[PDB]
Design a protein around this ligand. Sequence first.
Ligand SMILES: Cc1cc2c(cc1C)N(C[C@H](O)[C@H](O)[C@H](O)COP(=O)(O)O)c1[nH]c(=O)[nH]c(=O)c1N2
Ligand SMILES: Cc1cc2c(cc1C)N(C[C@H](O)[C@H](O)[C@H](O)COP(=O)(O)O)c1[nH]c(=O)[nH]c(=O)c1N2
Ligand SMILES: O=S([O-])[O-]
Ligand SMILES: O=S([O-])[O-]
Lengths: 312, 312
Amino acid sequence: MSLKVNILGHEFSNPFMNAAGVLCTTEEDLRRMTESESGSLIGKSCTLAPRTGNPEPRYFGLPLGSINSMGLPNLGVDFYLSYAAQTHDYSRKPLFLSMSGLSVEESVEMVKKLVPITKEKGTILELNLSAPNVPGKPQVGYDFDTTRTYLQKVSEAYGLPFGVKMPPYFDIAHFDMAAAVLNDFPLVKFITCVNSIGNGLVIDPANETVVIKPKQGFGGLGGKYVLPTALANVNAFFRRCPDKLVFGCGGVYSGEEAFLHILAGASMVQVGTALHDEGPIIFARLNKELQEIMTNKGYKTLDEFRGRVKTM
Amino acid sequence: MSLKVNILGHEFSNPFMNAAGVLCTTEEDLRRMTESESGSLIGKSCTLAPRTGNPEPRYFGLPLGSINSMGLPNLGVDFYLSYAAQTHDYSRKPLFLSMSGLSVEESVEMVKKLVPITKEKGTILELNLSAPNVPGKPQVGYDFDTTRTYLQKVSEAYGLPFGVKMPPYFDIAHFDMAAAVLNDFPLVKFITCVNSIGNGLVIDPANETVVIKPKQGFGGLGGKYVLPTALANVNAFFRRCPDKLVFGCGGVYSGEEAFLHILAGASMVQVGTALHDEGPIIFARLNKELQEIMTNKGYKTLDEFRGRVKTM
Ligand SMILES: Cc1cc2c(cc1C)N(C[C@H](O)[C@H](O)[C@H](O)COP(=O)(O)O)c1[nH]c(=O)[nH]c(=O)c1N2
Ligand SMILES: Cc1cc2c(cc1C)N(C[C@H](O)[C@H](O)[C@H](O)COP(=O)(O)O)c1[nH]c(=O)[nH]c(=O)c1N2
Ligand SMILES: O=S([O-])[O-]
Ligand SMILES: O=S([O-])[O-]
């Protein structure tokens, strides 16, 4: 039996990795992800210059998941590039970097710097089009003209296969419009579905006060809240973008949710809130739990069921 | 303490009503809602002609809520108008009707018929701009140009105060754009936030099959999934549309969630999934639970705390 995944030129030991933003900001974070049983890892969504992010408190664990407004705290693109070029052990697993410049001009500068490192080391780009916690910056993925500009300019500047992290969509017309843009860019080889459900609000009834400080308490939702939305997006793009891969992100706490993502079409499965809760030991648990499910169903590889969700 | 709400010159006994679509399609449904302890009730979102709706199965209760793709099954506008004009006991409580024409033309034809009944009986209109389960019909509320057209034509045709049922937004810019449209229409006196989180997907791991038949398993989510989104939408429009009321809908299972909606800015509080689960006896429970919280906090009226959520 095998959890192996063959995509983007690499053999991943298993389909699991961190969600961008969780256990991937510092060198120590990235070391712990590399030493984990995860099939891969992705660096914190970075900007050209360092950021310290939003004021505290900016993260609140919930019974059904999490709410956060981190604000893209990151050590700056030069740090992650240096990690990718010099520090990361590629013999253990492949590396993704998430880039989340706050303008197309910023993104172009950043991805240009990555080109030589991709060529030398094989580092993979995930362009973030869904940063919901940066004050005054709308989510790029909800504006299809802006999205087109970003994809055009990054395609020109980077010129190598890359992927995108998308915000969740909730309307069939939006799935259609998003896919129409994505399908115009052959260098976009994977779509990660989904980023946090943006701009939720949690209030503590006892003190009648919001639970996070930034943006009047408005923050991105993760965890159990997002699983159905995540599965829908994965499946919608799996079907609409047949010449691209889809990665699943949202609501994964166990092998069961991982199984559902893969059934829906996911090549790789990203873990955010649950990883934040449990630490990198979760990857060992997820591998065991997914294998358990496969044993019970008589599957020997992921290829036996990936994208084979049945409809009525 | 007092649970009363006083709006459009009507006294409501308490802020609770059904969410459109739940316990409100047939005469019997509406009877049970009228005989309940609810402060009000709303008719099923109707169309000019009757509809039988989407194929089965089209509803599935979930641990954390519900997924559905009902497809606007309704007895047609004439049925609901006749109910409003002849059958409903207004001495018990005020009545809302939800109207959900599939085109602006259809919507206009329907609201023209309501005019004399509103004048005679006080029946209140909620115009539905978020029907996520009609195959081939995008949610109007996610197209601000289309939304503007609907509000213009309905404002002109109806010429009386009315409300709108909005889809959930997940981006600050969308809150801004939605409010900009709504604020151009003075006859829009209330905004109901929110309809289902559209186009989620639930898969059964045992048979690897989606749980509802329509639209390859894609359906609207309600229940515990939607509470943070609902509260965010309520509060965003509470602040952005001071000339209007906001009604809360989403994730209400208890007096505690009701309290949070009102704290966020809600005038009326609608109950969907929980009512579907428990039946109209829920309204007796909700009144008691809200009364308990207000007593504990020393709030004599809802007006003492409506929209008074604290930020950091
Ligand atoms: C603390 C923290 C920080 C971030 C995030 C989340 C959390 C919890 N998320 C969103 C994340 O990648 C993921 O899409 C969501 O959390 C949904 O997955 P889960 O349901 O949490 O597994 C996120 N996404 C991204 O693309 N770049 C980032 O820098 C961050 N930052
Ligand atoms: C079976 C069923 C049927 C419908 C709905 C829901 C459900 C469960 N909903 C959405 C509903 O009004 C409400 O906005 C959501 O269910 C969110 O509230 P809850 O979290 O379920 O309380 C709905 N909304 C609407 O405006 N008109 C309708 O006809 C329907 N139909
Ligand atoms: O870092 S996240 O908050 O965009
Ligand atoms: O009736 S609901 O499915 O729009």
